[PDB]
Paper text:
[name] [name] up to three distinct [name] enzymes: NanA, NanB, [name] [name]. [name] adopts [name] same overall topology as seen in NanA [name] NanB, with a CBM (residues 85–271), followed by a catalytic domain (residues 272–740). [name] catalytic domain adopts [name] canonical glycoside hydrolase family 33 [name], six-bladed β-propeller fold shared by viral, bacterial, [name] mammalian sialidases.
[name] production of [name] from α2–3-linked sialosides by [name] catalytic domain is confirmed within a crystal structure. However, when [name] crystals were soaked with 3′SL, [name] is found in [name] active site. When longer soaks were performed, [name] is still observed in [name] active site, [name] cleaved [name] was observed in [name] CBM binding site. Thus we propose [name] Asp-315 abstracts [name] proton directly from [name] C3 position, eliminating Tyr-695 [name] forming [name]. First, Asp-315 is ∼1 Å closer to [name] C2 of [name] than [name] equivalent residue in NanA [name] NanB.
Author numbering: 83 to 741
The structure:
Amino acid sequence: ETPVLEKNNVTLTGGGENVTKELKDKFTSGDFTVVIKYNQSSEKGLQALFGISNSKPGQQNSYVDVFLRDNGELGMEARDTSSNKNNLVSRPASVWGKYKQEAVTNTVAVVADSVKKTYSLYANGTKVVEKKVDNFLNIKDIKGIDYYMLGGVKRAGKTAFGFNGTLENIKFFNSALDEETVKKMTTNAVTGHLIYTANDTTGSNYFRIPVLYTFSNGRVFSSIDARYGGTHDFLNKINIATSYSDDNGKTWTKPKLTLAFDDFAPVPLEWPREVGGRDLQISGGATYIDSVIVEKKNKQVLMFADVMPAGVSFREATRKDSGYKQIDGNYYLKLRKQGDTDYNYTIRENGTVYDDRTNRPTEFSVDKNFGIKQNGNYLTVEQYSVSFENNKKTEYRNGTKVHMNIFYKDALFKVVPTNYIAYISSNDHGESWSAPTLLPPIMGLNRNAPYLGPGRGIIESSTGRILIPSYTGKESAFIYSDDNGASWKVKVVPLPSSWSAEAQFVELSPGVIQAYMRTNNGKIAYLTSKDAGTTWSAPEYLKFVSNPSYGTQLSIINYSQLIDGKKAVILSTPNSTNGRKHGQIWIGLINDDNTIDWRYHHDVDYSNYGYSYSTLTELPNHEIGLMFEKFDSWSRNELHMKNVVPYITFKIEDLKKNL
Ligand SMILES: CC(=O)N[C@H]1[C@H]([C@H](O)[C@H](O)CO)O[C@@](O)(C(=O)O)C[C@@H]1O
């Protein structure tokens, strides 16, 4: 199939270009595909890449366009005045604006298919949306089309939605092209910045909570939440996926599921984005959520994550029970057998399940990956799938048999419905991993575990103390080990208010560490310890970030090279009171007195573009890796979007801006 019109290198500054002669009545069937490779000179205002309209007086609601907003939303309109049919199809956060001070080339497309009555939009290799509409209009359905233009829409003799930039290449076809052809046509350099993609080797359509870490051997490692039933924190099914690079982040391994349950199949699901329907959740698979990575002195790598039993959400988890008993001074994970009210059982030595009323072993045991055996044989349960087809959610037993697990809703023995922390270890830098270990009840028997602060942990240089950041909702919990991670303890620091205090650490000088964290007051807080984390200062606040009350996670890392003759820290966060937007990377130089001079910053894209959770690492060549949620992950308008967690690289000279 060849285009009815192809144009190259059309630079426009809001005035558009008439192409009526070269497109008039060429859309025989009425269907269309338009593929546009462009870059914007300015993101301001509502801008049309092209417009097909009735330009006559009174016919201002008779047009088709593809549009861009200042927040990266890609959409299309198809409207007819006399039928009063107004179709708008879009998805937030579909395009990129600028990157390292330069306009980004995107390639987008629209397909209108009369037989299916669907409009489809594509950006940078991804089908960002396909929607069937009852009031479907093709070009022939709109009355009195007489004007076709690039970079605007002709409404009552005036150019509306003027485009500012260059249409590097634009192709108009008079048919609906197939999905695979259009994905291929829109694939470009931007496509290559995704490490995790929808329905890759994770099986997940969605992702959140990226983490980057550079190991001692030069390997750059990533982990992420693979979130299967939309991007909901809860209820959902979530696994932790991983992917790594041995060439300074240029190429990455196909992602693997590293922490995953199998009560639910890890399947690609088309989660609804409509008002109302977008609130839909599955009934909940067992879940791993919010990963934290650290490399030990001995090069062993640890990964932590929160563990959620099936159907248990952070909102519903009981705060008054750890899920453990103490018996003869040992902490044993406790179990309730189906049909009991009390928790009468414990997992003791060798995974043997004991009846605590009699202090005798039962027929039952639990292996290192939480699977239940009876007399040495695995009990099983049937896996669940989720499906739509293509309007109504169904959960059903799918014919696959998996091991019965103490975290599953169909288990004969179940854990307390609360949150836990698990960790795993690797001796080959993330190629293979141990079985999980649940953290003992460090908060006490009658409190739930803390919640991890996603990102990294650190090794404090003077003592060797390992620090893992977490929070409870009213306190900071700094989890630590003084024996190279053989045993874990905690410092609980009460906070001014009920902050979701996701934190990250930096070391200023030997023994002096600061914990930077999310608050509920709009500011980033930092607490200071001068005894390697044993005691902490009252909070102080950065003076240059102002965010909404809900706040967002941040990333801060130490940097190994001097900047302006000084030891440096590097911080990533959104900075906007309007939402999770206006991503910034800040360089802080450490003063002789261990205060920080926040001297430089660089804006990641335009200020109304989305920016939520993020993660920084120093690459082995001293460049900076960044992976981030390129959307607003709090907004109810930006839920359940595919392919929006990119990875980018900066030289320090790219970052040394604004002073
Ligand atoms: C993509 C989009 O939102 N288009 C809408 C526009 C713009 O909001 C404003 O023109 C601001 O540029 O406003 C309309 O009232 C209009 O012009 O008929 C409805 C239309 O659907």
